Symmetry: C3
Amino acid sequence: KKARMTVDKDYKIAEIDKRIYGSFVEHLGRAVYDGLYQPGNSKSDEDGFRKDVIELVKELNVPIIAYPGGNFVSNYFWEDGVGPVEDRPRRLDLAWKSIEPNQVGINEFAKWCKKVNAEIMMAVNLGTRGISDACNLLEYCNHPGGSKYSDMRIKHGVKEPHNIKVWCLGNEMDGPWQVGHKTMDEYGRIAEETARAMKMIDPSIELVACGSSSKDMPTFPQWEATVLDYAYDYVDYISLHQYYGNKENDTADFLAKSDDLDDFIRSVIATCDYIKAKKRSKKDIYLSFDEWNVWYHSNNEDANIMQNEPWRIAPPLLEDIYTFEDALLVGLMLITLMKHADRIKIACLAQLINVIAPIVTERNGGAAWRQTIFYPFMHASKYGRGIVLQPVINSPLHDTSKHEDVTDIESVAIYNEEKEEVTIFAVNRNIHEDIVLVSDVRGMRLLEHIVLEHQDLKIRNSVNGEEVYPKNSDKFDDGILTSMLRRASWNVIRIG
Amino acid sequence: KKARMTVDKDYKIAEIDKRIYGSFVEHLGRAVYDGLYQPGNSKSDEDGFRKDVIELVKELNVPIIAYPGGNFVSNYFWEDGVGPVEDRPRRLDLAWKSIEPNQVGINEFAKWCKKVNAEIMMAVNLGTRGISDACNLLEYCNHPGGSKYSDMRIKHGVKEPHNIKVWCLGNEMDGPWQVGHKTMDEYGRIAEETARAMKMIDPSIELVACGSSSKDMPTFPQWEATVLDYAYDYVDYISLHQYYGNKENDTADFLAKSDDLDDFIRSVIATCDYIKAKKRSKKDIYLSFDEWNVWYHSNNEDANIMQNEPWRIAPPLLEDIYTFEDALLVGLMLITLMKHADRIKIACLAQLINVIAPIVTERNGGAAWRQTIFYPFMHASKYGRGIVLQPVINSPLHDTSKHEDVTDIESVAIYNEEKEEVTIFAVNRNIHEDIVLVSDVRGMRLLEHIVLEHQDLKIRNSVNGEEVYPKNSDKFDDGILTSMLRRASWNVIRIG
Amino acid sequence: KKARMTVDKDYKIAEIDKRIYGSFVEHLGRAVYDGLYQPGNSKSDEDGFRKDVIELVKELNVPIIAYPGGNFVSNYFWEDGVGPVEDRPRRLDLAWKSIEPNQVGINEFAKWCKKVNAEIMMAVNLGTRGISDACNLLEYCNHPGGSKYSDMRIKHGVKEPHNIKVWCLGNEMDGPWQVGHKTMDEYGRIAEETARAMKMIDPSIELVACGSSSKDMPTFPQWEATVLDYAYDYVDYISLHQYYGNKENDTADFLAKSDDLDDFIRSVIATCDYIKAKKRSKKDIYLSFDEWNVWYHSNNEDANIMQNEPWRIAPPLLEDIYTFEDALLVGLMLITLMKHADRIKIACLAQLINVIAPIVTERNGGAAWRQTIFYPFMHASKYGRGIVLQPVINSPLHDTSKHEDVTDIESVAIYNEEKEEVTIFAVNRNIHEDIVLVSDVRGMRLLEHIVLEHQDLKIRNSVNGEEVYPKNSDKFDDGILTSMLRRASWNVIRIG
Ligand SMILES: OC[C@@H]1O[C@@H](O)[C@H](O)[C@H]1O
Ligand SMILES: OC[C@@H]1O[C@@H](O)[C@H](O)[C@H]1O
Ligand SMILES: OC[C@@H]1O[C@@H](O)[C@H](O)[C@H]1O
């Protein structure tokens, strides 16, 4: 019933990179078609983009969105979605057994990223395509003009290069669910050669190599070690993916799963450093956590679609509707990323619109509303820029079904020297007792205390209204912050 | 002198899959051009199909034809043979050093197969091509509409998809004569990834993975083990090829070679089950014997043609003229296929028209006639449907030049329970003595005794008449079927 | 002081294959643009070729020219250099961060070769292309007509086929500087497979399989051994590459490096001879030294142009200005080449025009002079055809700073039956002492004694005049020819 913290200006971890507040839009389900893109609609601008979703994306201050996949890219032909809309084929999406009409291509989605204040992180097909087609698209997007593929982009109606900064070398081809699945050695070899060639057209890009699909894949972490061994001198990040679920209806254990995520991150970092010594590089690989969220609800009601109503345009796939306990994990995941901002410099909540998303529109026409997990993300993206200070913490301990010695309070401090604030994110994973948070701010006044709490852990939102929203609530003395955090609650504490 | 077997319904091996009476048409020699396709011929038709040869293959009751190869497939670009006949190019067929004019392509051949009451078994180029092009072809042939390659078939004049059921992942790439030769690991991976992609486009197809070119390749059967190791979960058959020849003028030995065929089949079956163990799979790989015949006569004039007379359209390649003794071995092989109907479920007599074939058309508008091998095949495909009874047999033996303890009689009884008939296929491999076959038919009225004999082993057929042809002949008490099998004869004995 | 050598028509070594006097034009810097092709210059013929450079090439008696690369070929798409010049696209050359206008293509450069009395040695792209694309280019060039890619060459204005006699399977793909770099086993297999299919199109070509980029690559000569182990049956040569430089400004050790070149060649022959035993072959693989020259001068100014003036057309890359000592190493190299005429049957001075070349043009206009190195290549190419006689030479020795026991006088004798000449090529790597070469000719009147000397080792040529040029100088009784060889001199002594 007591839990104490030391925070210390003079004791850094790293400076947060704003691209850990990134997200992700795949050509999956309704993410694009009647998601961000709804042409004739009364809520959509001239270009066909819904203006109300554009606003909700903007409240999340997302600086970077991954596109277009995801399993999708592994058999995507980027040429299909550029040029005259009349001349674009309908193609089979083998990943999500639906049909892709390809009205939103590179140029269309590059425009929507303007309107939401975000850079693209582009994924090349390394599944059924390779080196030279990754080069072409890089030439199309980044070369100013005067060559076959740059001029083709100008002719298509975009005179200035998109100048895309970060690229993913294909997408998690280690799974058996994946068109053009590759072995460690096959991918390490191809990621290397594609990295080498792409960096010859545009030496200012950064390239992400695909890590394991999940830490439960038998080949993790040898996949990482291998891939990196091949391509160390030509890449800048290794990617990680993790989704959690609560099909076990074990809220206590489900909230303990951010400890698996901490161990996962530490394992990938170990692998990197290991390969480093093997190469005697002075470089560090950074981490691109370009897929994370909660995802378990819509599992059964996606199997029905593919295939008994298959090859639909834009079927309602992966349409998870998130509960309160879910947003508790998201916050715990954000907090765990922030504790690792020294090697995680890019992260993507998967995904942004409709498909396991914080934003949702209703089917067949629209509405637009905030899921439970919108707000923890928002608080993180807004008050979580600056410097991360070490979690010098002692807090109570509790065990759960399949987890022992779980901290009752995860929390970290982010110190923005610019705005002379220190924001303290904290989550109480004790579903039962309430625990108060002493905080030895060896600083150098309390500014506010936002909170997200609820009685019913299974409570969802809906088009019809928000059951979960930041209620400014609660209650700091000498330079000692005293704050109380209810059983099972998300908390942002602020100081001026 | 006396050979005995007991024949009991309650002792089965399997049910015959009618697909073991299939054949094969390659873009080889005069098999298509100056064969089944002769556009301005009086005997021909609306589509250029010789109607006399359409009737001859109907006689053979062939339910499934592999197409278009064969070594030809490994460098074939299937789009060269579809769409506006004028726009189709002339291609070098590197395999058989011919020129392919592509006047007959997918759709042409596909509507010759209806006319002869058969279905395509489609081979995809995995020599100089790969996953993406296999998917393109599969979608073209099987996806209904509203997608690039299915609308392309529709625009091409075929409004209904061909819905091709069985597809062969390439062709025998283990040999050094193949353009695009692969090692076993190389091929095993591309077969695995193509199988996985195709089954995402159409889950109802069956896939066959390529086995060794022949049992005498030093990579046999480790090839079959490596391929299946990679592709087990996504493919349904493993292919087998076998040819026999009598270039040593030793008829006694030449007819014992069906014993070596049995040994070969058991090795592929064993290799399969071993890998089954590895994978801990409940699934059975079945055998696709998609290339078998006698083939030795024209070995020389083929070498004279390529390459002294290279790059012709429709050279007269691989035109074996078949002997009666050859027709004996073919029958001995069919019986041996039958005796393995439980694992062998697709088989292909290589090939159907003109090229090592039971049907010849003479040349430059030709004639059309049945070779000796036409007939044992017709007796098997016609009377060989139903259930195969375990050949409980004790018959005399004889050594040969290179084989020991070789049976004199080779029979298999198969039972059709709706027809209320039981047919005994039986061959006397003793080309000296005559043998009486006492068959205990555990009750259960004889219907006929068809026979294929000749005094002249090396006799042929020709356009000027048929020296070998079914002679209704011969020569059943209580329940003992006694019938006399002449030296070097093919016998089909029916009770009813 | 004195040095004894004896020739002998009886002590042979090999007939000179005139293809040891070959050269090489890459699409690199000003070799093509503002080099041999200047389509509105006052000195350029109907097609655009500077007729002064054509006359200068014709002086060098170059029978065979490698093209288009070189690193350029590893991302080249040969279709971009054929057809309407209006429709040819401009391409990023990743190799040299240049734009490729593709105004000179296969067909253009084939005409240039007629005018210089030379033939193409063609490189296919095996970095980002493969079997079927080398098959198309070989059908374009060598098939007479009546197929897709030969008819296409006809449509392009070359009715008869170029019939390219030797082809190069890719280019030095072991460096980390090259687009599409491959490993030993990758290249070994792509080479074996490409060779196998090409030789099915045109059996009369010869194929060159790439060796290492240099004798110093760690992978040397396991590369050579592995590649030949895959490709032995279908390739005909292994390539070699060596360049020299004097950045250390040690003249006498720099004239010594030809000993390293001899050692280099012997290792490769050892390696071929080892795989030959392994294969139990009766075939020898022959050596194609298709990149050799001195290269060290422009290494400063070459990086200053990339990437700081990147993506220019025709930048001044690799414009080495050759001194006199340079011409002397080039002379020894040609001697060491000729000395190995039994295994070296193709050799290319790299490169021909402006890029590390013997012929230069001044830029943005014209000029055309001869670099110092022009002259030893000229003498060798003109007087060095016939039979290389085995040299027996007792010559004095000398040490240098990093070479021990270095011949003072290096010499070799070529004998032409059709002129009973016996041209002798000798050089004095002793920059200090003068040596006289008695030559005991067991022939067989003296004809000339062309000489190449100068007292400033660092003296160059320029547009403003050649300071280094052949002087008919010097200074043969009955049996003995006596010839004084000044220090640092190249000599070509004749007999008739
Ligand atoms: O993000 C949803 C899907 O989950 C993962 O398996 C894939 O990367 C992605 O396409
Ligand atoms: O059936 C004729 C040929 O023989 C086999 O070896 C080839 O696969 C096939 O094309
Ligand atoms: O001089 C030739 C160039 O330099 C070499 O290193 C490359 O092979 C080639 O492109």
